[PDB]
Amino acid sequence: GLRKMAQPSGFVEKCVVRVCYGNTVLNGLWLGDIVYCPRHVIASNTTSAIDYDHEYSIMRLHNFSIISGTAFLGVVGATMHGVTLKIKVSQTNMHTPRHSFRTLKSGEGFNILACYDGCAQGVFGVNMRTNWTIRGSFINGACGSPGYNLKNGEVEFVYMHQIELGSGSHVGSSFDGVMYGGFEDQPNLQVESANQMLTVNVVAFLYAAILNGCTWWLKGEKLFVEHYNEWAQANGFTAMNGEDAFSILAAKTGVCVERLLHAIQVLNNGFGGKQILGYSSLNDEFSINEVVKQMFGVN
Amino acid sequence: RKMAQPSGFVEKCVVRVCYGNTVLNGLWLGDIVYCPRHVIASNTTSAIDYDHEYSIMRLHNFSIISGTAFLGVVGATMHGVTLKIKVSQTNMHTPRHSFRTLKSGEGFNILACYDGCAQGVFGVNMRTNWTIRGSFINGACGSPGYNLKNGEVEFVYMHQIELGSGSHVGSSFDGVMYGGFEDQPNLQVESANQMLTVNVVAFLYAAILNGCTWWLKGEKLFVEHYNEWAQANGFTAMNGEDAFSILAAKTGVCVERLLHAIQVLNNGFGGKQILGYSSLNDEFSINEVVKQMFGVN
Numbered sequence: 340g341l342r343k344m345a346q347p348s349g350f351v352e353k354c355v356v357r358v359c360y361g362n363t364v365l366n367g368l369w370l371g372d373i374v375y376c377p378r379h380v381i382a383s384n385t386t387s388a389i390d391y392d393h394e395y396s397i398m399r400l401h402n403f404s405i406i407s408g409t410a411f412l413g414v415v416g417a418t419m420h421g422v423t424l425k426i427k428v429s430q431t432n433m434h435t436p437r438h439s440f441r442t443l444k445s446g447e448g449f450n451i452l453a454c455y456d457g458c459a460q461g462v463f464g465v466n467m468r469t470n471w472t473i474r475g476s477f478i479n480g481a482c483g484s485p486g487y488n489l490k491n492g493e494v495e496f497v498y499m500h501q502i503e504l505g506s507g508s509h510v511g512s513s514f515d516g517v518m519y520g521g522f523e524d525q526p527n528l529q530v531e532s533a534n535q536m537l538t539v540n541v542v543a544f545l546y547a548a549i550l551n552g553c554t555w556w557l558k559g560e561k562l563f564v565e566h567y568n569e570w571a572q573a574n575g576f577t578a579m580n581g582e583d584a585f586s587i588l589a590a591k592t593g594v595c596v597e598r599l600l601h602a603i604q605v606l607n608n609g610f611g612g613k614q615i616l617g618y619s620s621l622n623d624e625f626s627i628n629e630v631v632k633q634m635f636g637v638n
Numbered sequence: 639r640k641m642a643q644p645s646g647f648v649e650k651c652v653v654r655v656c657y658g659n660t661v662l663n664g665l666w667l668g669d670i671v672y673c674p675r676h677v678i679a680s681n682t683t684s685a686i687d688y689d690h691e692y693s694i695m696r697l698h699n700f701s702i703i704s705g706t707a708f709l710g711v712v713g714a715t716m717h718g719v720t721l722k723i724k725v726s727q728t729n730m731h732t733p734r735h736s737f738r739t740l741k742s743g744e745g746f747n748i749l750a751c752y753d754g755c756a757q758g759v760f761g762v763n764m765r766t767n768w769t770i771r772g773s774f775i776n777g778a779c780g781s782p783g784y785n786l787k788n789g790e791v792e793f794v795y796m797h798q799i800e801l802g803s804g805s806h807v808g809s810s811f812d813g814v815m816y817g818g819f820e821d822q823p824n825l826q827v828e829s830a831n832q833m834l835t836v837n838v839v840a841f842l843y844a845a846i847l848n849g850c851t852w853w854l855k856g857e858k859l860f861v862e863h864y865n866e867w868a869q870a871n872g873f874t875a876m877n878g879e880d881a882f883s884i885l886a887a888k889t890g891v892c893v894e895r896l897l898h899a900i901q902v903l904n905n906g907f908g909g910k911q912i913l914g915y916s917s918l919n920d921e922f923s924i925n926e927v928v929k930q931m932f933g934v935n
């Protein structure tokens with residue numbers, strides 16, 4: 340079958356801490372001797388526009404409390420970097436994993452460790468959508484929850500949770516302190532752009548259906564990538580690219596991309612009660628990488 | 639959003655178990671390694687006489703690796719469809735834990751492992767036909783299923799086989815195969831799956847709490863009439879209306895209006911969608927819905 344999976348969370352869980360500042364609690368990420376967390380933790384009043392330079396100048400280090408498991412950490416300094424704080428603590432996290440920082444591109448998959456009061460509660464896989472929001476599941480207290488990927492024996496930290504938009508979509512920042520999509524960490528309504536279905540993930544899904552033997556939707560007609568891309572601009576799908584990446588899948592099946600792009604056009608009107616790998620409409624959750632790892636064990 | 643509970647406490651308990659040329663995953667708790675008994679079978683190709691395989695077992699064929707260390711086997715005994723392998727070494731990362739057998743409908747977490755190393759983690763439900771909708775390939779056997787609850791890890795599932803349908807079957811850690819399936823290379827057909835009605839009701843209450851209510855009408859379907867419709871339409875009977883009384887009280891919507899909606903929505907969504915789903919969804923339990931939206935267990 341095909342299940343949306345998270346990569347294991349163990350390396351990340353040892354780094355999550357609780358960050359208290361005055362009348363606000365949220366989550367931080369403890370790496371080396373730095374704790375990363377959203378800068379709005381220091382905002383005393385969030386019922387009007389937040390002047391972060393003012394909040395920063397009145398900040399006093401003795402109002403911080405940072406808790407790892409049951410241990411308090413000594414706070415030594417704190418600097419502001421975009422929409423994040425970098426808090427210097429007197430102790431090094433001896434469980435700091437091998438890691439780097441990376442900024443997600445449009446459509447890329449990653450993992451969210453949903454944390455509360457400095458303790459992890461759930462983990463799930465998710466895609467950065469073309470409108471720079473994610474479909475998460477967060478309630479109050481989740482700010483500072485980290486997003487990550489495991490690659491080559493290294494943790495890549497990619498997302499720090501920040502805000503929930505009026506529509507229910509979730510916005511975070513990189514650990515550089517740049518908010519995805521340019522959203523503001525301000526208490527006021529902001530509207531995101533319309534979402535686009537990720538065409539390359541729908542193609543990979545349809546290959547998966549072929550390999551699992553679900554072929555009823557498959558015809559023999561081809562739709563040229565260029566003709567599809569004009570249709571996608573008018574129907575809320577991203578353009579097609581990287582057809583060469585689908586070599587692996589096209590070989591094992593003997594079906595070409597341009598036949599599936601035809602199918603994408605047809606199946607956008609509904610599955611008519613039929614179900615493809617157990618879904619009743621097109622799914623853009625799965626990348627080529629995931630299909631290929633889950634079906635064949637090849638990275 | 640479907641999620642899993644975090645895996646850190648379980649990851650340190652998974653080991654790589656090799657017997658001869660067969661490799662799979664074991665669970666290291668205390669001084670015992672638990673794993674599927676087919677690790678000692680000579681030919682996973684034809685019928686297996688496990689009493690014979692156990693009698694010719696030779697313990698020096700074992701190799702058990704946790705990270706970089708080798709564990710020393712001192713004995714092994716066979717219980718149901720599992721092996722309990724006693725080693726010299728006690729797992730110093732053993733979490734507070736118990737073993738529990740899942741009932742029909744219950745959700746749990748799977749840590750999919752290969753060669754003794756965790757690769758992914760996802761939530762599942764034990765279906766009424768005693769299979770789960772998983773994702774596994776060769777090498778996944780022994781992958782553990784777990785729940786985190788009341789400051790301890792409950793271990794509930796050991797992965798064992800893929801049915802010809804693609805559905806997946808495991809055992810509890812007392813050696814009892816869920817569904818009574820056999821750990822043999824023969825085609826076995828599970829019974830027909832049923833949609834879990836309590837989970838579908840949980841989902842519609844989730845929809846109401848998020849202001850998704852186009853489908854909601856005023857008509858009421860009494861539980862006994864629904865259950866008659868259910869037995870003939872591949873749905874489970876309505877039960878445990880107790881936790882739903884709480885949701886009914888908060889939303890003002892009685893369960894009987896949702897049972898009616900199920901009967902109607904079963905014939906398709908008419909184009910529209912519910913929480914982004916294009917058809918009835920029974921993947922979420924009432925606990926998951928309450929935990930995710932209100933933060934309470």
Ligand SMILES: COc1cccc2[nH]c(C(=O)N[C@@H](CC(C)C)C(=O)N[C@@H](C[C@@H]3CCNC3=O)C(=O)COP(=O)(O)O)cc12
Binds near residue numbers: 385482525
């Ligand atoms: C009137 O203004 C609005 C209008 C319409 C929509 C709006 N949306 C936000 C927003 O997103 N506000 C951030 C803080 C900003 C103002 C600095 C926030 O609330 N984040 C949560 C996680 C959120 C909470 C529920 N689900 C989550 O993902 C934290 O965890 C961190 O802070 P808190 O734990 O709540 O104290 C303000 C707002």
Ligand SMILES: COc1cccc2[nH]c(C(=O)N[C@@H](CC(C)C)C(=O)N[C@@H](C[C@@H]3CCNC3=O)C(=O)COP(=O)(O)O)cc12
Binds near residue numbers: 682780800823825826
């Ligand atoms: C040929 O007759 C059949 C007919 C129809 C359906 C059938 N199904 C099986 C089966 O499932 N067989 C068990 C081995 C038992 C019988 C001893 C198995 O293959 N288990 C996998 C997990 C599986 C592997 C693929 N996806 C998974 O979930 C392990 O992990 C251990 O095996 P490996 O050492 O890793 O290959 C045999 C069979």
